[model samples]
Target chain A: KVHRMPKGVVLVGKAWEIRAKLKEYGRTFQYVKDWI
Target chain B: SIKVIGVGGGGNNAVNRMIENEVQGVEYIAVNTDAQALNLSKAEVKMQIGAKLTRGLGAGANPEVGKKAAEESKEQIEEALKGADMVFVTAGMGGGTGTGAAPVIAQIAKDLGALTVGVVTRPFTFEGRKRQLQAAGGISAMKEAVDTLIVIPNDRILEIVDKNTPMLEAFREADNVLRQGVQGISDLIALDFADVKTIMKGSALMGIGIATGENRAAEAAKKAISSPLLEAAIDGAQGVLMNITGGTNLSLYEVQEAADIVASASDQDVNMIFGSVINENLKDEIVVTVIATG
Candidate 1:
């Protein structure tokens, strides 16, 4: 029932995946909203 | 209910009157490269950028000039938005200052730890393709910069309003609709917006979804879950918040049903946060708003 492409649609994922690769999360997420 | 900052002349003009007339707890600010237009907002504090480059004339319809002005004014913009918990940034794109600085304004609010939302109006089709192309580039930059982008196509105004409507009236109508929309966000998430904010924290992609007619609750839930107004990078989203709103008739059964649809598409580990907003008037309608915030 998940809609794709369609960006912004929130889908749940395995928390295990995030737990497995924490460093990759820091590299990809746009969490730092400063200086450009 | 929050700070609604208007960026550039067009943004100020659109929200200035509406903000003045309404009772919503929204603090309004106007920013522009044009010191003159910035001056017109006598009541609201105005931030003028690029005083050296534009000499108080305006962005001259050039987005580069507008961008330069915003860059110069960034420090002031950051200072003005201080202490705001939730910021709503609005502008009419394809023009000068609005095209250039609104995104930067959103970024500033986000950097300040405030949840940010952007409502942008596109140009009328008659404005010609050059303006439209300029707007396209502006929109592309804006989408990536802001947490959420709600776009209103000006050309669609003709479809909503009578074609015979005067130019000023048409724009006014559109602004009013947008104004109502901001109020909806402020008012939509049940009686406690604080809780929703606490749940949906972090820099994230967000958008709204609404459904009305027939079995409005379940239908609206599906609508909000399946489709979003603006595209956001939701793959890595750590959390989701869905605000359900409807008339007094809105039921818990519908809420459960809606939750099922959302969970169906989401990971088993992710717990969706849900809130309700009741309005006695919407007996047959439902509006589901999704802020896929992490």
Candidate 2:
């Protein structure tokens, strides 16, 4: 798992949404996600 | 790795050092209204662009002056923005050149369809409440002009530096932190962007907006404001605008969470995020507008 320091912890949940989106997108883009 | 364009002197130096020290692969461009300063820093910075304005230092606190600076620097800014995947604008505020020039530069990048983010440092408290007021106004204009705005308070920097440290060193240290903060966000988001798309092309843009807030609620509200743009970015949005307005009643943590929430929902690489804190009385809100292109 890629870890990042949230610019502000308060925004972690929102940031998770982004992470989830990427993960979801990743499933469809298996090769690209692995490369990135 | 991103393309960063500095408007005016301080910004130029800061961007140059950042490239030299941290992200070597990143591209740097310095824009100045002053021919002399631009010439002086050319070797240190990778790309140097000059504008035809007096002294090259932006006009402080005057919207009219800011507008003129923006107009003057338009072409050079546009050229610098070409083919950039992500653009970061750094400049000192409460000055005529950067305050004015940055917004226009942001507009130019927006027109070119690059994701634009602005990092601005406010004047020191010693500059007095008047200068602070001027900075507020200039920043307000910048808020409206750019996609995302991250601000650092000079006064806060002064407090953190050692008494024995040279003023320049102290300022540089402060700037380093701010730049790191911005780059940290970029690194995280870029990783995600890359994960989704092997390559980012076309007119997609991401904007970031940040602010220091008193309470969590206030912070959350600001994050909410920028959410729409984040949503658009994840969806492969073409044009998106996000805004955040905050007041003293708001909680810093809340705003932070709000920001994260917006980032989460959109799932898009943000094109831009612009955040600002108003007086204690102002209401908190996040406004986002998106334009899509296949």
Candidate 3:
């Protein structure tokens, strides 16, 4: 996640909540290159 | 049809910035316990709360004082939010007035049967532990009162701006995010007012990813998805409303790419609703406004 990026006015929640929300948002699979 | 209110000094500053940037189709108001600050606002209406309590000074970084201030002018705040299909409340937390009055106003708006969303800013890292805790307390109360909450910390303002951005410019950038967030919702409801209401059901998370030049649309979409500000108690969002603003040269394929990029960031089965407003003034620029949730 370090080499990832920093581009915009990004604001997230508590501590682990943001990463958890990322996974919570159905990130189980990619949909663009992998959209079935 | 809608009321966009800035509560307290922080909120009023944001309201002033939005007015400068020209947010349309919404009545703008500023509410504050500081009479001096209220006088500084050029908004359509400026309200002073708890005149007798603090003599229009401020809440003195005390939430109790802020709450009492709002309670003092409860009726006037209600009157301002009347007949609104939706409400956007903006405030910068950590201080007395913003932390205190934002929740009260949001709660009142929600009680009046309006879908309320709060955009609030937290203090910087060096602002002391007391102020930081104060902001958190305010956010908690605001979340309870509003349907959705978007919280941005002031410390991260530099991460999105240039190296030597002036104090006012950095603040303006923060304020612009709120403006874009509000406009994104406006885009959603303007196209299908009734349908968007159902789509935005439950708590929501909002953010903006603005970029210019080549591949900007896709870049903006990717940026927004990854940078969403808040997501407390929200489910795997099943819907997304994307507001795309770009120049005449912006292509449909680019827009589709942006949409797909956004879709790739969320629930696989989520439905998409999009609204585009063309601005001739914008050349080679794309601003993707997203309110992602169900």
Candidate 4:
């Protein structure tokens, strides 16, 4: 039961995903890792 | 039962500033791979990590070297952080020592059964691509090591400062943000480490905000939400820990007012804990500090 986050919220992600997000922000499945 | 540790050069600076400000209710420690930087720290407990590997020299901006240094000093790090009910690890990522050693230190604290929290900063964009890549790797490791990790992006300092502000002063602004987070958490810990601990449990990523001004309660709360150090929109956050500080004239109504503002902005089922302290130094103004985690 993952709660959906609003737009513009930066979700913590995996190492590689974080690097990608740092360069450009977007939604990803890696968010589930933090909530799980 | 609370220990606030500064790891690496920037982290050492954080610890020194906290001591200078007379922040109370927590033991201070400074750990570093650089002997020169460690020598300047005023923390009661000071350690030079990776002595054999670095030979009292610094990590030379290599995170791998920094990580190895921390690995070599595991036992000493464990001894320093042992028996803490809660631990706040402060550092500046992107460089060698802090980027490398903070996660290792945090893992040791967590393994010792302490509620480990990391308050760290990402380097400014101007620091170049190499530091940015290093920061990302360190942040990822820190998230895995601590119960809650709060990140403040250094570039955001531009949002609040004037164009002419000197580099050192601008950097201090970020340091003040870290100070506010540590100080607020320490005060709330006095209210009850259990509640603060509960709010932080399993919260892998966190953001913090601090505001001080007129209309004390309302203005502070509104600003905190809008101007978090990490630029996070935490309306869907799972947990919120807030603290209010003001002079003797502080009242229950003011505290409740601030709490209401924050609560209204967060998820209805948010696990929120509120604490307030009477700080004579605040005079007529109020300071609000909020930590949002999900």
| Candidate closest to the true structure, highest DockQ | 2
Candidate that would win on TM-score: 4
Q: Fnat of each prediction? A: 0.06, 0.03, 0.00, 0.00
Q: Which regions of candidate 1 fall more than 4 Å away from where they truly are?
A: A1-36, B188-294
Residue lDDT tens for model 4, B55-98:
98989878887889999999999999888988888888898989
> lDDT tens string, model 1, B1-294?
357777776677756765554524567777888888888864367778788879888888788888888888888888888997777777778877888888788888878877677767777777788669877787776776666666666776666566699988877865654554454455432133344444433344334445666666677766655553324544445566555556655555554456555545555576445444554455667666655654
lDDT of 2 by residue, B1-294 (tens): 356766665566566566544544357777666556566543244333333445444344454565576576566567667887667777667665566677777667656666666766776676677667766776776666655665656766655456678777866764564454345344334233332222222333233333343443434434333322222334454222222234433333343344444444444554433222222334443222121222
Candidate 2 ranges beyond 4 A from true positions: A1-36, B40-50, B55-67, B163-166, B189-294
Runs in model 4 lying further than 4 Å from the true structure? A1-36, B191-194, B201-214, B228-230
DockQ, candidate no. 3 = 0.03
TM-score against native, each model: 0.62, 0.55, 0.80, 0.84
The positional error of residue B234 in candidate 1, measured at the CA in angstroms, is 16
Q: Which ranges of candidate 3 are over 4 A from the true structure?
A: A1-36, B163-168, B190-194, B199-204, B228-238
Task: Provide all candidates' interface root-mean-square deviations.
Answer: 13.9, 13.5, 14.6, 17.8
Clashing pairs in 4: none
Q: By descending DockQ, how would the candidates be arranged? A: 2, 1, 3, 4
Model 3 C-alpha lDDT per residue in residues B1-294, reported as the tens digit of each score = 777788887788778877775656678888889899889886888888889888989898887788899988899889888898788888878889889988998999989988787878877665789889998898888889887776776776666667798877876776666666676655344233344555544446665677887778888777766663534322366666666666666555555567666656656555555554554567777778777666
